[PDB]
């Protein structure tokens with residue numbers, strides 16, 4: 001559904017039986033979630049932001065529901081201050097930017 | 100126009116006479132450009148992001164032509180890895196996120 005950007009474009013996700021809200025972020029290549037618990041195996045990874053770079057856990061083939069849209073992707077979990085859905089998943093849910 | 104998120108949504112801006120490319124960014128509350136010379140007056144501000152806080156300088160009332168459209172607003176200049184057009188300006192160009 002169309003959102004304007006007068007306010008932060010925030011949605012509910014369900015991941016891992018947990019309900020979260022996350023920011024739809026066209027600038028973010030990758031989806032990055034704060035610390036929460038996920039089952040399984042993961043690889044260490046670093047990503048950059050402004051500020052600097054953080055070190056995250058790289059889980060993949062994770063099912064997320066974002067609004068009513070399912071999508072399976074790579075998720076990075078670590079010290080971001082806000083959960084971010086980025087392009088690897090906004091592409092799966094079909095989001096566009098219009099101006 | 101309409102951007103699919105398979106590529107980074109980069110766009111051409113003209114600011115202060117200069118021609119830059121910049122990221123259209125729904126998750127970013129403000130616009131922050133890399134260092135460049137702007138005339139006039141500014142004051143120091145700090146912003147956060149993933150993995151830290153940079154100190155930035157704030158110019159208000161800068162004209163920016165973004166794609167083709169003119170908008171005027173505050174632009175923060177500072178050590179970002181990339182020019183980022185955030186919601187303060189995206190609202191002025193009419194951008195909508197649309198799934």
Ligand SMILES: O=C(Nc1nccs1)c1cccc(CN2C(=O)N(Cc3cccc(C(=O)Nc4nccs4)c3)[C@H](Cc3ccccc3)[C@H](O)[C@@H](O)[C@H]2Cc2ccccc2)c1
Pocket residue numbers: 025026027028029030031032046047048049050080081082084086124125126127128129130131145146147148149179180181183185
């Ligand atoms: O995949 C990623 N990186 C990779 N590395 C290797 C492979 S992929 C990646 C994933 C998510 C975010 C980012 C890094 N990132 C951010 O750090 N910011 C902070 C930001 C950017 C611009 C303005 C503000 C702002 O106004 N902040 C304010 N603070 C106080 C008041 S306003 C904040 C937000 C997200 C955010 C919002 C609020 C708080 C924290 C973060 C942007 O929305 C994101 O697009 C992006 C911008 C960016 C993109 C590339 C390089 C550098 C910066 C990178």
